[PDB]
């Protein structure tokens, strides 16, 4: 005789969903995404001083 029960007073918090754009650190980035990066060889970024 093995009885299976379930509480009605207390519920869990399984997942803690942390988004990076919720953080204060997301200033220091420029978060632009490719949906194609693995197809790319050496990409370059220019500066004129």
């Amino acid at each position: 005789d093995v009885e299976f029960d379930a509480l009605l007073g207390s519920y869990c918090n399984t997942l803690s969903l942390v988004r990076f754009l919720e953080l204060g650190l997301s200033v220091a980035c420029v978060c632009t995404k490719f949906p194609e990066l693995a197809y790319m060889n050496e990409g370059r970024v220019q500066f004129e001083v």
Partner: protein
Amino acid sequence: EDTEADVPVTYGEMVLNGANLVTALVMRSLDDVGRHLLEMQEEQL
């Protein structure tokens, strides 16, 4: 004493007698998770 017998044809089956209650909902009050527990026991009858 006898020649022709009576033999069952249908195999028996099973009735699910008790199983673990595991649900969740993505958040609607907090109490409606409990009323979702009764939705799944009614589907087991």
